[PDB]
């Protein structure tokens, strides 16, 4: 069988705090040599993936001793002493007991901490150009929201609808989203969000 | 030092080949198994495969969604490792990396950017956003490759700019959308490099 | 935008040229006439002047009659007048279909508005304004 490796996939952190992801291993980790065969990986946004922490708990040389790490024999835990605006990114739980490794795990998702905002709803009808030109894209915006957990409906249903969600700036510290529902020529003739930032949905339509 | 810089990017279409070399420099070649590593745009890692070290001597081991598609070799003497791509096909369209080693991936070269879409070079069909009474934006469907960069007021606006990432359709083609949200007849300019396509474009409810 | 600019304008050659010279702008623009301005005031005592022809040849030699620096310029063309504003496409719009205005950065400088500006100006209008107003140099040096 294959060792299922699952971490709380989402770590809201903000600078200046302690924060503590840990793992799911199905089966055990913990081989006869005594070491833990997991690895902790970062893939820093726009840059290369680095080594944080291997066999469990042994740093790498390089990276801050701000990832310490340890872990029992199924349950793993990197204890990211502190994190910075530097330290925002995905980290990866990969198992490296048994070869291959095809699978990174889906990835952490770690973010600026920050108390929850209200998504900006705007329904943008497509120009009447475009409708000349060939083709009609209506755009549900979402803007200056946080955490991003909410995908947008196309009703009056879904299902040409692709996401260009954002990455987070730096002063603000919000997500954007971009819901494009491509269309054809005669079906031209509504969108809501179920963020936690609000609890009723909201229907704006064009 | 260590480096593991790579090269060997481009623009192909499904079933042809590309080159992809991992240079290596600071160590000793032989004594770790060079690992091939590929990262879908904005989404999971997958990883393709690793050649044993000739000291170990082994195999090629690969994923299994490239049997018979992709090899690895390796030398010393000019120290460079090897990714083959063979019948290429859309999914091969990512970030390939080059990892050093087939359980520790402790190194990490830089990514080239292997593109495998079936679009051709042509200017974007810029699509402006009337707003509804507020934010206003301008799409930038049907555009290919991806060097992009949309400014609003043509540079002069920086204060609620989001540039959306690139938009992925079945037609090999991209689709941008930057919008500022401020209330108010603004200006939003893409530029193309590599087909020369300037459009500057007004905007109004 | 330079190589259309001198390829459209190379035709005007044979009605009219430009000159420059280092005369203080109060005597030079008391005697100036018969479709004759100061292009462009690089100082109070260096002026440019755009005039036409039989009348700008003797504006150098209204200033070699003084004994001041003479240059018949050979690159003589024309600009900064009506006679280049004419055309409102190939020389207003034609040579730059294409521009990026840049913001702040470090600042640069303008002269046709007399003061320093933000990078959105520069466009085919600029040279718009460069064939149709003056340059007024000497108080952008003034405000530099």
């Known amino acids: 069988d294959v060792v299922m490796t699952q971490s709380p996939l989402s770590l809201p952190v903000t600078p200046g705090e302690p924060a503590s992801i840990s793992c799911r291993s199905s089966?055990?980790?913990?081989?006869?040599?005594?070491?833990?065969?997991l690895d902790w990986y970062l893939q820093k946004p726009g840059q290369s993936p680095q080594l944080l922490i291997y066999l469990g708990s042994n740093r790498a040389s390089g990276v801050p001793d701000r990832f310490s790490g340890s872990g029992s024999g199924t349950d793993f835990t990197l204890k990211i002493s502190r994190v910075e605006a530097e330290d925002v990114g995905v980290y990866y739980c990969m198992q490296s007991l048994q070869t291959p490794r095809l699978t990174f795990g889906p990835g952490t998702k770690v973010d600026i901490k920050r108390t929850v905002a209200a998504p900006s709803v705007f329904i943008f009808p497509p120009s009447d150009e475009q409708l000349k030109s060939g083709t009609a894209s209506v755009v549900c915006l979402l803007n200056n929201f946080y955490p991003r957990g909410a995908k947008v409906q196309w009703k009056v249903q879904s299902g040409n609808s692709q996401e260009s969600v954002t990455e987070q700036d730096s002063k603000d510290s919000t997500y954007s989203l971009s819901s494009t529902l491509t269309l054809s020529k005669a079906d031209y003739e509504a969108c809501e969000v179920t963020h936690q930032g609000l609890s009723s949905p909201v229907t704006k339509s064009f | 030092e260590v480096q593991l810089v790579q090269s060997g990017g481009g623009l192909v279409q499904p079933g042809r080949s590309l080159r992809l070399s991992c240079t290596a420099s600071?160590?000793?070649?032989?004594?770790?198994?060079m690992s091939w590593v590929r990262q879908a745009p904005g989404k999971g890692l997958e990883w393709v495969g690793f050649?044993?070290?000739?000291?170990?001597?082994?195999?090629?081991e690969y994923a299994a969604s490239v049997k018979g598609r992709f090899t690895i070799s390796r030398d010393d003497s000019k120290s460079i490792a090897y990714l083959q791509m063979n019948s290429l096909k859309t999914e091969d369209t990512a970030v390939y990396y080059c990892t050093r080693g087939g359980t520790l991936f402790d190194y990490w070269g830089q990514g080239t950017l292997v593109t495998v879409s079936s679009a051709s070079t042509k200017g974007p069909s810029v699509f402006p956003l009337a707003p509804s009474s507020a934010a206003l934006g301008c799409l930038v469907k049907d555009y290919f490759p991806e060097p992009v960069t949309v400014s609003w007021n043509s540079g002069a606006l920086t204060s609620g700019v989001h540039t959306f990432p690139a938009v992925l359709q079945s037609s090999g083609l991209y689709s941008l959308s930057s919008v500022v949200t401020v209330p108010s007849t603004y200006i939003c300019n893409v530029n193309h490099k590599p087909s020369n396509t300037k459009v500057d474009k007004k905007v109004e409810p | 935008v330079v190589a259309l600019r001198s390829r459209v304008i190379a035709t005007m050659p044979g009605n009219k040229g430009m000159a420059s010279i280092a005369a203080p702008a109060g005597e030079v623009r008391a005697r100036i006439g018969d479709r004759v301005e100061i292009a462009a005031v690089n100082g109070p005592r260096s002026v440019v002047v755009a005039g036409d022809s039989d009348e700008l040849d003797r504006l150098v030699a209204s200033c070699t009659t003084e004994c001041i620096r003479a240059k018949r310029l050979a690159v003589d063309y024309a600009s900064h007048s009506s006679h280049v504003e004419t055309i409102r496409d190939a020389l207003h719009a034609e040579l730059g279909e294409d521009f990026h205005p840049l913001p702040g950065f470090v600042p640069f400088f303008s002269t046709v508005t007399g003061r320093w500006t933000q990078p959105d100006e520069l466009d085919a209008g600029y040279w718009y304004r460069n064939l149709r107003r003056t340059v007024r140099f000497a108080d952008a040096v003034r405000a530099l």
């Open positions: 600071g160590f000793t070649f032989g004594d770790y198994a």
């Open positions: 089966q055990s980790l913990l081989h006869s040599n005594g070491y833990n065969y």
């Open positions: 050649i044993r070290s000739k000291a170990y001597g082994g195999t090629t």
